[PDB]
Amino acid sequence: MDAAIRGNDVIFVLKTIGVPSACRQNEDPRFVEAFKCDELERYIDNNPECTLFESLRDEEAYSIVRIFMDVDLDACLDEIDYLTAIQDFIIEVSNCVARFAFTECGAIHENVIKSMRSNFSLTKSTNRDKTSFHIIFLDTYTTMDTLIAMKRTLLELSRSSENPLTRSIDTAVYRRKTTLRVVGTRKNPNCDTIHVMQPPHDNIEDYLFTYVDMNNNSYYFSLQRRNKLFNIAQRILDTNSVLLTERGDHIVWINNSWKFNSEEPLITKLILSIRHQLPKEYSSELLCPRKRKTVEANIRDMLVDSVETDTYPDKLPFKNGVLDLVDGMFYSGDDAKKYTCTVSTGFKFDDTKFVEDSPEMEELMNIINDIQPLTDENKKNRELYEKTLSSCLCGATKGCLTFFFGETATGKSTTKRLLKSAIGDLFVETGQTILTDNPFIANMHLKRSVFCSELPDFACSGSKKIRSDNIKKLTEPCVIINNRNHATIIIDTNYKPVFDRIDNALMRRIAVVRFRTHFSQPSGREAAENNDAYDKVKLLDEGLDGKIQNNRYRFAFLYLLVKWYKKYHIPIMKLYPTPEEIPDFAFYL
Amino acid sequence: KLWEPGFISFEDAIKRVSKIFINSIINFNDLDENNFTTVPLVIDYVTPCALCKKRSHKHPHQLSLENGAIRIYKTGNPHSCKVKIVPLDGNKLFNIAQRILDTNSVLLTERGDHIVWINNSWKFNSEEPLITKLILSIRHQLPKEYSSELLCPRKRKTVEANIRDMLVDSVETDTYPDKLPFKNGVLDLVDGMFYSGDDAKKYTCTVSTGFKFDDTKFVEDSPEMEELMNIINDIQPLTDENKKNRELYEKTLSSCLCGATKGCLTFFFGETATGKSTTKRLLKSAIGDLFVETGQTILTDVLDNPFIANMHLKRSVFCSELPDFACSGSKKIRSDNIKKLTEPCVIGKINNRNHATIIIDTNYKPVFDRIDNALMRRIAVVRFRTHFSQPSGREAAENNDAYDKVKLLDEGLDGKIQNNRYRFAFLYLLVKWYKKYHIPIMKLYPTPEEIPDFAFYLKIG
Amino acid sequence: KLFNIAQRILDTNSVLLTERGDHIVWINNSWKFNSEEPLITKLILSIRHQLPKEYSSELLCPRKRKTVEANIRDMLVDSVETDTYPDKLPFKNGVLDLVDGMFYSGDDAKKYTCTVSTGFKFDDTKFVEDSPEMEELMNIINDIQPLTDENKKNRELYEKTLSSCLCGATKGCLTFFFGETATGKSTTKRLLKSAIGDLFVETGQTILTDVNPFIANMHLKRSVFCSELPDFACSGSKKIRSDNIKKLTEPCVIGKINNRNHATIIIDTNYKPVFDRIDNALMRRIAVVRFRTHFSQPSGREAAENNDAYDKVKLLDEGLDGKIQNNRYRFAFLYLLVKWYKKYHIPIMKLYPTPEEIPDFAFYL
């Protein structure tokens, strides 16, 4: 919010109709002029015969305007009926504008309602035989492009309501270079019908839609983003917006995403949604619930071929589209509907943060270089760590399990938190019951990363060993009543695991990444470098966590993961085991 | 062609306009698509005119086409008759449904559920949908030509279906942690301001304490406030030794009003007759339905379970009487829950939001099966050291080292607190402490140096 | 006149009734079957074209179409069985004969009421004979099982067992893939499922050592595999309990409590299992498959040439697994299976047990 956004006390006015933009940009004195409230007051007082059309200098910097409307009815109303009509008109319009702002501009509905219904100004035309007036909401300010977007909703509002004042809303005034007759001036020199100010607003300042004076009672918002039924059913199917899956349920394409019909039915929601892009002679018919259910039955009965879902393992789905792994391109729209994506990370993909440089990417490189130093000793461990974290972006079956082994305060939990903040809902934490002992396995479906945590040192007594039968069962592509296993399974260990039975099929499903960097307290820092289990000791950062849960490093780590994947798992994704690190496997070796 | 047949068949429009005119139309036959804006509509006024309610009209009426509608107006004297409008596009029930959504009285959350705004509070139900109750409630806020037809039940079912099928996108609820919702409004904690009406609407608060807020009690002075200080002074002495425990107690008490995720679990440790259950009852009476007592299952019995699903959006969960887990024949705390009960979303619709302060009362120092450094960071304990015993056994309590003071028991406090006598004074105290500690940041600090089990690890250090 | 439409639709004989109480409809050259969502209405829309236009106009309105399907439901009385042909392979776009190599796509395939399918469209340009793929596939089969004089009875019983995975009847014997590690048992499983598509199923060891979705899911399947029997010969293991082996051979398996067994039960193991009891009925339902080819790495290859459990050792091909998961051998192996089946199980399909290979049976022998 700048000074011009704060307010604009200088006004610009024309003197006739049809002035070319060349004259306006040439500040032609015969047509355009600049005034203030007081200057225009004496101008209109001294020269009533002139015609004055107030507008903006340009739409680039002064897009903020008071919300205004022009009502023109070819009739006359008595005072009491006029009051009833104006009350109904004001309640309907205030509601409609507030709802549009809430659903598009993301503003508070009640704030808009209060600001608009609290204070507004009405004009009055001297033409007795017609009811013509201009309504200006004093305290509500909005950018011009938002009004240009809202003209539609006002058009359907006018076409829908029965109130004559609301039915006679003139939406044509909402367009670039909009000029409105200033109250007190004639429409044309040959017409003697002018507009009259109304109480309690006795000041001319209350009758200009460009005069911006934002006070405590004001609110601001702007648009964030700059037989016949059978024919309707065929038209809907032509858009390829609804599909049948193998599970017997139908997936629909609403809000640029594929959803399930298992909830309250969505086919009807689609049918209402696409009534705008369809010819109006059918759009009239489409809005009765019985006919809409009839069209829905036709659509169900025309869908015979069942299409498999989630066929691409090399695509990362977001809630605003899908990202290609081989490329860095992001698709948002009909390019993403081609890939039948059912789940998503749950957050909008931001191209402004997915750049490469990032104000936080350097500190991310510091954090990753602290948790895993890029040294000649941390060379194979580091690349194994990179590949294991990269495998979480691919939606295919993973054939190996990696054990995250490290001592206390080695950054493993921060690593899980980075991974979850980077891939959204695609990372899930699972308990130890799937190892030592079934919702713990049924909601694992279509997940791309599953983590188990704090194994309670099974080497000592009072523990139920790993029983690698689970490891063999967690490697098969379909998990048992059946679910698709697309999840890289990672295990947190502070102590090396122990297994009851060791087989030749177990060395091919076990991987280990070692963590040996300690983030210690200043007081206990000394007692940190007398231990052989650490290679580097760094000061503990208490402010790191608070940054972590706030999704501060959400997109930089995603960029790192995709860049690693572009290096390692292209064109083939495979995880290789490293049996030579667990001592327990040395025995048979 | 004066008629555009893009809206409705001309015959149907003429049928509608004739139906409006209760009196017989004289020249009905000659109205065609090329004259209906020209020929006056001469009417035989056997009955009173359907528009002006007079005996008859001196001059015939006339039709005009504008904005996809027919305007019916009288010639001669305009003010002598009422202007009439005939629409041509939209099922009237769809217009009503558009108006009702337009008000933002009905919304849907991420749970696939639909919340409504009835009687100044965001009602919600799953077994019995209540959109139609909203329609009855809101019919007063619409013109007459909608209220007259919102009465028939099947029309309301149609409007409900339209509203269901138009509400596509989900909204987020309960985003303000420093707001206390009642059934008649929302109290702000940063200020002392209370919002009742459409002001409480902006905060999508789907839960409530369960009792109406009263401005006549929430003042400061109060008939009950002074003995409320007396009670809180007795339960927690305002002394230099029991000094730090006092603000720790007040912070734990205030952290039950904020609707966010809490980063610690508090233990009320004290002997018998120390007033821990007194504080339990005071909190329950003070915050209504936002306080919930759970069993010991969510500590010792596998979570994934009504006792873990009922804590959805509750701001205080209190656990009672851990049965001496130090001795034999007991199941330990199994700190995996401590890992689980603090992280923001509770699994157990298996996902629920955690806004609850977990307070566990005990007489014995409890033990965990496993002790980890993550337990160092999320456990605080409150010490209670004032005895309220009967006159008979005072000396037997005054010679015990587990008490620093023994006071005479009053038998009438339980009935009075059960009657919500200290309901508002205690809430006032909670707000005062919240402004003292939790502004602008709410976070809880552990006290690892108090649990004896953590001493051994400190002995290791 | 909707009765006339229902009469015509039954005249086309597209919808049929089964003894299970459910209706099957001929949509898109396949005997589609469903219980949750009845498909008669989809059939009516599908065949609305094959009726005089005065009816095709009326079939659009869903109320009229539901009335038509109600009439159809009320017309059908007698059920018409299902899946009576064992020598037919039902594909996704037709059915393939086993006696001949002729493939049907159209009303020809509807005569054989085949409800299950391989799940993939059949290809005419690959099921030829020569194939760039068939050469390497035949070399792979030669490597896994040498075509030698000693590997004559073992190889032929291997071919018989693989052939019997195509016939849709109840089988009379069970064999065990007994062999040491790196011998191609997983390769055989992968090739078999790649060749037969959806008709394959992998199931755990529960249906063997225990008395149940693991048993009712094999309805009308043509191959079931059990894998990694965990050394029942040693301690800490649950013995075979061959009563299940008796139960898995009889045609109608209990586990809707009845299911039709058209699936060959095969277990691949590394160790010879131990049986609870040896009765004379067990002798006629156990067979043995042996593998003696080791696909080892060059480093440990010499240690594989000194092992008495291996006949030949060959160099491991790391990319073969990725190749067979790409189903490149999909139709050549099907060609081999068809040729072996036409060689062995015509005109009679019956499996001969081999009690002489089991060591545990020797004692009563």
Ligand SMILES: Nc1ncnc2c1ncn2[C@@H]1O[C@H](COP(=O)(O)OP(=O)(O)NP(=O)(O)O)[C@@H](O)[C@H]1O
């Ligand atoms: N690069 C870093 N610099 C400073 N502090 C860090 C860094 N990385 C992590 N930390 C902090 O070090 C502490 C330990 O991290 P954490 O991820 O919990 O380790 P861990 O190895 O999973 N621990 P544990 O469960 O005890 O084995 C946390 O407080 C982190 O915020």
Ligand SMILES: Nc1ncnc2c1ncn2[C@@H]1O[C@H](COP(=O)(O)OP(=O)(O)NP(=O)(O)O)[C@@H](O)[C@H]1O
């Ligand atoms: N003819 C062949 N040419 C090349 N590679 C082959 C051939 N046959 C098998 N292989 C590969 O050699 C490896 C050993 O086969 P595999 O099926 O795993 O043996 P196995 O005896 O079932 N193993 P196990 O489960 O350890 O008892 C696999 O990677 C096969 O893909």
Ligand SMILES: Nc1ncnc2c1ncn2[C@@H]1O[C@H](COP(=O)(O)OP(N)(=O)O)[C@@H](O)[C@H]1O
């Ligand atoms: N300040 C006080 N004055 C008088 N009686 C008091 C008191 N504080 C608590 N009491 C009473 O003494 C008992 C102690 O409270 P209670 O919550 O039951 O104690 P405890 N068993 O949980 O340690 C209760 O019966 C309570 O009513």
Ligand SMILES: [Zn+2]
């Ligand atoms: Zn009249």
